């Protein structure tokens, strides 16, 4: 019923948070690349 | 080439979620209005009485 469709609308919301998650995966990857370059510089 | 094939075979998780959201909201409405639509004949019968 209504609260079911409501917490799976929160679900369409959390996979949009799972769109943020792609974004966070890229930021993690980018931080890793930055650290790699820095240690290479050393 | 992997990146290109991925561009061809990888989609907007967001777009798909949006489409599903709209479809989900529509489906419950359809069920409920079907249930209500059955009532109209019932009330015409009530009038019959």
């Amino acid at each position: 019923s209504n609260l079911p469709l409501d917490q799976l609308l929160t679900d369409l919301t959390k996979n949009e948070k799972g769109r943020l998650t792609p974004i966070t995966k890229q930021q993690s990857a980018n931080s890793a690349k930055l650290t790699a370059y820095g240690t290479l510089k050393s | 080439l992997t990146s290109a094939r991925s561009r061809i075979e990888d989609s907007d998780y967001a777009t798909e979620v949006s489409n599903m959201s709209r479809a989900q909201i529509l489906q419950q409405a359809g069920t409920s209005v079907l249930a209500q639509a059955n009532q109209v004949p019932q009330n015409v019968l009530s009038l019959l009485r």
Side-chain angles (χ1 to χ4, degrees), chain A residues 8-21:
Chain A
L8 294 323
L9 65 76
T10 319
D11 186 8
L12 43 80
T13 326
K14 36 186 82 43
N15 37 27
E16 301 209 353
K17 308 168 206 177
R19 175 205 322 199
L20 322 170
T21 325

Side-chain angles (χ1 to χ4, degrees), chain B residues 9-24:
Chain B
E9 293 192 286
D10 293 334
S11 65
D12 183 15
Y13 176 82
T15 301
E16 299 145 282
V17 164
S18 175
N19 304 330
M20 171 154 16
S21 173
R22 200 188 306 262
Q24 285 186 20

Side-chain angles (χ1 to χ4, degrees), chain A residues 19-31 33:
Chain A
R19 175 205 322 199
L20 322 170
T21 325
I23 331 304
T24 58
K25 297 140 49 60
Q26 328 146 331
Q27 75 65 47
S28 70
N30 295 174
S31 306
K33 97 174 99 155

Side-chain angles (χ1 to χ4, degrees), chain B residues 3-10:
Chain B
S3 302
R5 191 181 67 169
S6 151
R7 288 187 207 295
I8 300 154
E9 293 192 286
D10 293 334

